[PDB]
Design a protein around this ligand. Structure first.
Ligand code: MYA
Lengths: 387, 8
């Protein structure tokens, strides 16, 4: 079964990952480069699925197929430690995460039951240029690995990982980045999720959170209380004319970390140009008409296995003139103004400078960052600049 | 792929 701590993991044997070009769990890494020479010929045939299951590439432009994808994900995707909450991926959100610039339909890899055509499996790859230490390499970001609950523990996830690798090798890419809540060989960096309450009562009824030892409900609300309006001057939603400068600010600010994306202006528009109930981005235009900072957070509500828990996830926040503490404080205010219930943020990047000061509490979940077929020293959360 | 964390 899954393992959530490395202590838990170092006892486990990895029947699949020991066969993969990833550093072993105990191995200390001080080299820089791939684990495997690029393959000159790639298997033309799809891998063999267990009897009664077939490959199918999902055309998310077909609204019916996209409906099949979110229904699969909304019923069988990531859950919390206690099986109380499950992500509620909207169709318009998945198009955002699954059709960025450069997407390929054969990278929307799904598994269907042969007889019924019922979608029972999925995995995805989107292209991304990744800066890791001192190498800028083109990789894919693997996301949305999902085997239906009725098919679990039958070694169908390894087949999905192999088949998506094959389809990415065919396009000439040989590295990949991905995250996870479980420990596998081998985390290049471990990031903790932190949680800032915005509506304490909602998260206490639903049992997302709990009242601290000697603290009433009344005090808890007066504690997380926030201003009605933000305080940074010139804060406003990002517009079309801000795509160049948001690219500029993000391109530069990101260079101080060791694992970061490398975005074209077309990609910066896609990932940051606001879409309601998907992505939000606010820029800080100063008294001279210049844009100096921006904050961003994306929307991902969670079904409650017992309405929905509206969560805001901190995305990329770039500061040059506004103090990051004030920037992130206004982010909390804007999230509250928009009806969110909680503001989730990792401890990666400079987030540790404000997580305690802005009343974040620590979460019971770590997000391990992995690289496929790339052997490099691991880093701390503050060096991981990839959300 | 994400993970669902929540306050310790
Ligand atoms: C060149 C480009 C290459 C691109 C490829 C890059 C690699 C991408 C790598 C994947 C990027 C994922 C990115 C995301 O989206 S991480 C999100 C993962 N999704 C979920 O947790 C959703 C809920 N769970 C499920 O859908 C299933 O339980 C999954 C699919 C997780 C496996 O449920 P099942 O019980 O049916 O599994 P199995 O018995 O068939 O097979 C188990 C084998 O697979 C190992 N396993 C278990 N969990 C994960 C995991 N979360 N990531 C990678 N491997 C995992 C497991 O330890 C064992 O290996 P080993 O222990 O024997 O070694």
């Amino acid at each position: 079964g899954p393992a959530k701590t490395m202590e838990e993991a170092s006892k486990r044997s990895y029947q699949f990952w020991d066969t993969q070009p990833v550093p072993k769990l105990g191995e200390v890494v001080n080299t820089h480069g791939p684990v495997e020479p690029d393959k000159d010929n790639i298997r033309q045939e799809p891998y063999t699925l267990p009897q009664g299951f077939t490959w199918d590439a999902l055309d998310l432009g077909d609204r019916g197929v996209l409906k099949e994808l979110y229904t699969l994900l909304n019923e069988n995707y990531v859950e919390d430690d206690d099986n109380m909450f499950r992500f509620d991926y909207s169709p318009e959100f998945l198009l955002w995460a699954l059709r960025p610039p450069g997407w390929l339909p054969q990278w929307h890899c799904g598994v269907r039951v042969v007889s019924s055509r019922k979608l029972v499996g999925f995995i995805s790859a989107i292209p991304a240029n990744i800066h890791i230490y001192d190498t800028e390499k083109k990789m894919v970001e693997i996301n949305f690995l999902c085997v239906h609950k009725k098919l679990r523990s039958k070694r169908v996830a390894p087949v999905l990982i192999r088949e998506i690798t094959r389809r990415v090798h065919l396009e000439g890419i040989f590295q990949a980045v991905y995250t996870a809540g479980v420990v596998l060989p081998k985390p290049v960096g471990t990031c903790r999720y932190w949680h800032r309450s915005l509506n304490p009562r909602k998260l206490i009824e639903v049992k997302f959170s709990h009242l601290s030892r000697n603290m009433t409900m009344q005090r808890t609300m007066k504690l997380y209380r926030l201003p009605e309006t933000p305080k940074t001057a010139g804060l406003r939603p990002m517009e079309t004319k801000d795509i160049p400068v948001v690219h500029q600010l993000l391109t530069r600010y990101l260079k101080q970390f060791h694992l970061t994306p490398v975005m074209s202006q077309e990609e910066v528009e896609h990932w940051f140009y606001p879409q309601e109930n998907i992505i939000d981005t606010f820029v800080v235009e100063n008294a001279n008409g210049e844009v100096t900072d921006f904050l961003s957070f994306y929307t991902l509500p969670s079904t409650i296995m017992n309405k929905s828990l509206k969560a805001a996830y901190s995305f990329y926040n770039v500061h040059t003139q506004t103090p990051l503490l004030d920037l992130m404080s206004d982010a909390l205010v804007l999230a509250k103004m928009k009806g969110f219930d909680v503001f989730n943020a990792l401890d990666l990047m400079e987030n540790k400078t404000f997580l305690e000061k802005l009343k974040f509490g620590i979460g019971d979940g770590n997000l391990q960052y992995y690289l496929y077929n790339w052997k490099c020293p691991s880093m701390g959360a503050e060096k991981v600049g990839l959300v | 792929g994400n993970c669902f964390s929540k306050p310790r």
